[PDB]
């Protein structure tokens, strides 16, 4: 039998950064498809993009600073190659914003690394990103906070985007995710991101959902889910999860925002991809 963790959403974590999930949400009218590289996993249990199993690998980086450039390796310290992916596994996939990551070392006693993922120098795909002043040495890095992109000019934080990993061109990204249509809309898991703003980071799946699927590699056109309140046990709303690894629901007019987060998604059964959902 197929299963989704029997755990409240409020006790789970975002998949594009190590942040507790504060709510569920929907994308703006100018957001059709999404192409997040992290937090990507099929129900089959297959991981895609730079998505890792453990949240300990999310939005992190490993590499040796050259003084002018940083040559990337996997979190492991093992070589990373272009043919492998848009960038090393776990690498930050947040677009539309500058990055500020905490750099630490194994054997030395932290340094802030300000990242503008926009210049020619930002080429994670070829395992190289500018060392914006980071001294020579090896490092471990975690996204600590973000800020507005420093170049589209006057531009604001846009966490629906994915950073420009290349250009070299074919960075081998994970396919885009599109709403199935029919009034159905993609559901996102929101987490509050530190920074000089009210940034809300969206992700298709909580991190522990990804580790549950990769483990419980269960062999369904679409999964009919019930958002259930643990205590009362009442069904708070119908939802659907698709093979490719995302959830959808039909907002009851101008949806999931109006729902509490201390609930749980329970699998009911396998239904037709064209199964008309009851408005949420």
Coordinates of C-alpha atoms in Angstrom, one line a residue:
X1 CA 0.0 0.0 0.0
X2 CA 1.1 3.5 -0.9
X3 CA 1.8 5.9 2.0
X4 CA 2.7 9.5 3.0
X5 CA 4.2 10.2 6.4
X6 CA 1.7 10.2 9.2
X7 CA 3.2 13.4 10.6
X8 CA 1.8 17.0 10.9
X9 CA 2.9 19.4 8.2
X10 CA 3.9 21.9 10.9
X11 CA 6.6 19.5 12.2
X12 CA 8.1 18.9 8.8
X13 CA 10.7 20.8 6.8
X14 CA 10.9 22.7 3.5
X15 CA 12.9 20.9 0.7
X16 CA 14.7 23.9 -0.7
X17 CA 16.3 25.1 2.6
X18 CA 16.4 23.8 6.2
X19 CA 13.3 25.7 7.4
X20 CA 10.2 24.5 9.3
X21 CA 7.1 24.6 7.1
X22 CA 4.8 27.4 8.2
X23 CA 2.0 26.9 5.7
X24 CA 0.6 25.6 2.4
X25 CA 0.0 27.9 -0.5
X26 CA -0.6 28.7 -4.2
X27 CA 1.5 30.4 -6.9
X28 CA 0.8 33.9 -8.2
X29 CA -1.1 34.4 -11.5
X30 CA 2.2 34.9 -13.4
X31 CA 3.5 31.5 -12.2
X32 CA 2.3 28.7 -14.5
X33 CA 5.0 26.0 -14.3
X34 CA 7.8 25.7 -11.7
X35 CA 11.3 24.1 -12.2
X36 CA 12.8 23.7 -8.7
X37 CA 15.9 21.5 -8.7
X38 CA 15.7 20.5 -5.0
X39 CA 12.7 19.0 -3.3
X40 CA 12.1 16.9 -6.4
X41 CA 11.1 13.3 -5.9
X42 CA 8.6 11.0 -7.6
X43 CA 6.1 8.8 -5.7
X44 CA 8.0 6.0 -7.3
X45 CA 10.7 7.1 -4.9
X46 CA 13.0 8.4 -7.6
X47 CA 14.9 11.6 -6.9
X48 CA 15.4 14.3 -9.5
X49 CA 17.4 17.5 -9.8
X50 CA 20.0 18.1 -7.2
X51 CA 17.6 16.7 -4.6
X52 CA 19.2 14.7 -1.8
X53 CA 17.7 12.2 0.6
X54 CA 18.6 14.0 3.8
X55 CA 17.8 17.6 4.8
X56 CA 21.4 17.7 6.0
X57 CA 22.4 18.1 2.3
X58 CA 19.9 20.9 1.4
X59 CA 21.1 24.3 0.2
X60 CA 24.7 23.6 1.1
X61 CA 28.0 23.8 -0.8
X62 CA 31.5 22.3 -0.6
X63 CA 34.6 23.5 -2.4
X64 CA 38.1 24.9 -2.2
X65 CA 38.5 28.7 -2.5
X66 CA 41.1 29.7 -5.0
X67 CA 41.0 33.3 -3.8
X68 CA 39.2 34.4 -6.9
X69 CA 37.0 31.3 -7.7
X70 CA 35.6 28.4 -5.8
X71 CA 35.8 24.9 -7.4
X72 CA 32.9 22.8 -6.3
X73 CA 32.8 19.2 -5.1
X74 CA 29.9 17.2 -3.6
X75 CA 29.0 17.7 0.0
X76 CA 31.1 14.5 0.4
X77 CA 34.2 16.2 -1.0
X78 CA 34.1 13.9 -4.0
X79 CA 34.4 15.2 -7.5
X80 CA 31.5 16.7 -9.3
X81 CA 31.2 16.8 -13.1
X82 CA 29.1 18.7 -15.6
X83 CA 27.5 15.6 -17.1
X84 CA 26.2 14.9 -13.5
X85 CA 23.7 17.8 -13.2
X86 CA 23.0 21.5 -13.0
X87 CA 25.2 21.5 -10.0
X88 CA 26.4 19.4 -7.0
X89 CA 23.7 17.6 -5.0
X90 CA 22.0 19.8 -2.4
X91 CA 23.3 22.9 -4.0
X92 CA 21.0 25.9 -3.4
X93 CA 18.2 26.1 -6.0
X94 CA 16.7 29.5 -5.0
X95 CA 16.5 31.9 -7.9
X96 CA 15.6 35.6 -7.9
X97 CA 17.7 36.7 -5.0
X98 CA 21.3 37.1 -3.8
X99 CA 22.6 34.5 -1.4
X100 CA 24.4 34.8 1.9
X101 CA 25.8 31.5 3.1
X102 CA 27.7 30.6 6.3
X103 CA 31.1 29.1 5.4
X104 CA 32.8 26.9 7.9
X105 CA 35.8 24.5 7.8
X106 CA 36.8 21.0 9.0
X107 CA 39.8 21.7 11.1
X108 CA 39.7 25.4 11.4
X109 CA 37.8 27.8 13.7
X110 CA 32.7 31.2 10.0
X111 CA 32.7 33.5 7.0
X112 CA 29.8 35.1 5.2
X113 CA 29.8 34.4 1.4
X114 CA 27.7 36.9 -0.5
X115 CA 26.5 35.3 -3.7
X116 CA 25.1 37.1 -6.8
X117 CA 24.0 34.1 -8.9
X118 CA 23.9 36.4 -12.0
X119 CA 27.4 37.0 -13.3
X120 CA 29.3 35.0 -15.9
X121 CA 31.4 33.9 -13.0
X122 CA 28.5 32.0 -11.5
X123 CA 28.8 28.6 -13.3
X124 CA 27.9 25.9 -10.7
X125 CA 27.3 23.5 -13.6
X126 CA 31.0 23.6 -14.5
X127 CA 31.8 23.4 -10.8
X128 CA 32.9 27.0 -10.5
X129 CA 31.4 30.1 -8.8
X130 CA 33.1 33.4 -8.0
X131 CA 34.8 33.6 -4.6
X132 CA 33.4 37.0 -3.8
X133 CA 36.4 37.6 -1.5
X134 CA 36.4 34.2 0.2
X135 CA 39.9 33.4 1.2
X136 CA 41.8 30.4 -0.1
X137 CA 40.9 27.1 1.7
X138 CA 38.2 24.4 1.8
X139 CA 34.8 25.1 3.0
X140 CA 31.3 23.9 4.0
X141 CA 28.4 26.3 3.4
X142 CA 24.8 26.7 4.3
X143 CA 22.3 29.3 3.2
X144 CA 21.7 31.4 6.3
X145 CA 19.7 34.3 4.8
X146 CA 18.8 36.0 1.5
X147 CA 18.3 39.4 0.0
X148 CA 17.0 41.0 -3.3
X149 CA 18.8 40.1 -6.5
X150 CA 21.6 42.6 -7.0
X151 CA 21.1 42.8 -10.8
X152 CA 17.8 42.7 -12.5
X153 CA 17.9 46.2 -10.9
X154 CA 15.3 47.3 -8.3
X155 CA 14.2 43.7 -8.6
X156 CA 12.7 41.9 -5.7
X157 CA 13.0 38.4 -4.1
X158 CA 11.3 35.8 -6.4
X159 CA 11.6 32.4 -4.9
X160 CA 9.6 30.8 -7.7
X161 CA 12.6 31.1 -10.0
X162 CA 15.7 28.8 -10.3
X163 CA 19.2 30.3 -10.5
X164 CA 21.0 30.5 -13.7
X165 CA 23.2 27.4 -13.3
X166 CA 25.1 27.8 -16.6
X167 CA 26.3 29.8 -19.6
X168 CA 27.0 26.4 -20.4
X169 CA 23.5 26.1 -21.8
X170 CA 22.4 22.5 -21.4
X171 CA 22.8 22.3 -17.6
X172 CA 20.7 19.1 -17.5
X173 CA 17.9 20.6 -15.3
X174 CA 15.0 18.5 -14.1
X175 CA 11.9 19.0 -16.3
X176 CA 9.4 21.7 -15.4
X177 CA 6.3 20.9 -13.3
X178 CA 3.0 22.1 -14.8
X179 CA -0.5 22.3 -13.2
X180 CA -2.6 19.5 -14.6
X181 CA -5.3 22.0 -15.5
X182 CA -9.1 21.6 -15.0
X183 CA -9.2 24.1 -12.2
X184 CA -6.4 22.2 -10.5
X185 CA -3.6 24.3 -9.0
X186 CA -0.2 23.3 -7.7
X187 CA 0.1 23.2 -3.9
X188 CA 3.3 24.6 -2.3
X189 CA 4.9 24.2 1.1
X190 CA 5.9 27.5 2.5
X191 CA 8.6 28.3 5.0
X192 CA 9.8 31.7 6.4
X193 CA 13.3 32.6 5.1
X194 CA 15.6 34.9 7.1
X195 CA 16.5 38.2 5.5
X196 CA 15.5 41.9 5.2
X197 CA 12.0 40.9 4.0
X198 CA 8.9 38.7 4.4
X199 CA 10.3 36.1 2.1
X200 CA 8.2 32.9 1.7
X201 CA 10.0 29.9 0.2
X202 CA 7.8 27.4 -1.7
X203 CA 8.6 23.8 -2.3
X204 CA 6.7 20.9 -3.9
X205 CA 7.3 18.5 -1.1
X206 CA 8.4 18.6 2.5
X207 CA 11.9 17.1 3.0
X208 CA 10.7 14.2 5.1
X209 CA 8.1 13.2 2.4
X210 CA 11.0 12.8 0.0
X211 CA 13.0 10.5 2.4
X212 CA 9.8 8.5 3.0
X213 CA 9.2 7.9 -0.7
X214 CA 12.9 7.1 -1.5
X215 CA 12.7 4.6 1.3
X216 CA 9.1 3.3 0.7
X217 CA 9.8 2.8 -3.0
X218 CA 6.2 1.7 -3.6
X219 CA 5.5 0.7 -7.3
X220 CA -1.4 4.7 -9.9
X221 CA -2.5 7.5 -12.3
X222 CA -3.0 9.8 -9.3
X223 CA -3.2 9.6 -5.5
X224 CA -6.4 10.9 -3.9
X225 CA -5.5 12.4 -0.6
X226 CA -7.4 13.7 2.4
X227 CA -6.0 16.5 4.5
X228 CA -6.9 15.2 7.9
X229 CA -7.0 16.8 11.4
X230 CA -5.1 14.4 13.7
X231 CA -7.3 14.9 16.8
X232 CA -10.9 15.2 15.4
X233 CA -10.0 12.9 12.5
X234 CA -12.2 15.0 10.1
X235 CA -11.3 15.3 6.4
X236 CA -10.3 19.0 5.9
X237 CA -10.2 18.8 2.2
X238 CA -9.6 16.6 -0.9
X239 CA -6.2 16.7 -2.7
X240 CA -4.3 14.8 -5.4
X241 CA -0.7 13.8 -5.7
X242 CA 0.7 13.0 -9.1
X243 CA 3.4 10.4 -10.1
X244 CA 5.9 13.2 -10.9
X245 CA 6.0 14.3 -7.3
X246 CA 3.6 17.2 -6.6
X247 CA 0.2 18.0 -5.1
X248 CA -2.8 19.8 -6.5
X249 CA -6.2 21.0 -5.2
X250 CA -9.1 23.0 -6.6
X251 CA -9.3 26.3 -4.7
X252 CA -12.8 27.1 -3.6
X253 CA -12.8 30.5 -5.4
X254 CA -10.1 33.1 -4.9
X255 CA -7.7 27.6 -1.0
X256 CA -4.9 25.8 1.0
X257 CA -3.9 29.1 2.7
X258 CA -7.1 29.1 4.6
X259 CA -6.2 25.7 6.0
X260 CA -4.3 25.0 9.3
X261 CA -0.9 23.4 9.0
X262 CA -1.0 21.0 12.0
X263 CA -2.9 18.5 9.7
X264 CA -1.8 15.4 7.9
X265 CA -2.1 14.1 4.3
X266 CA -3.6 10.6 4.2
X267 CA -3.7 8.4 1.1
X268 CA -7.2 7.2 0.4
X269 CA -6.9 5.5 -3.0
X270 CA -5.7 5.5 -6.6
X271 CA -8.0 7.5 -8.9
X272 CA -8.1 8.6 -12.5
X273 CA -5.9 11.6 -13.4
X274 CA -9.1 13.2 -14.5
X275 CA -10.9 12.8 -11.1
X276 CA -12.9 15.9 -10.3
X277 CA -11.8 17.2 -6.9
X278 CA -14.1 18.7 -4.3
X279 CA -13.3 22.4 -3.9
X280 CA -11.0 23.3 -1.0

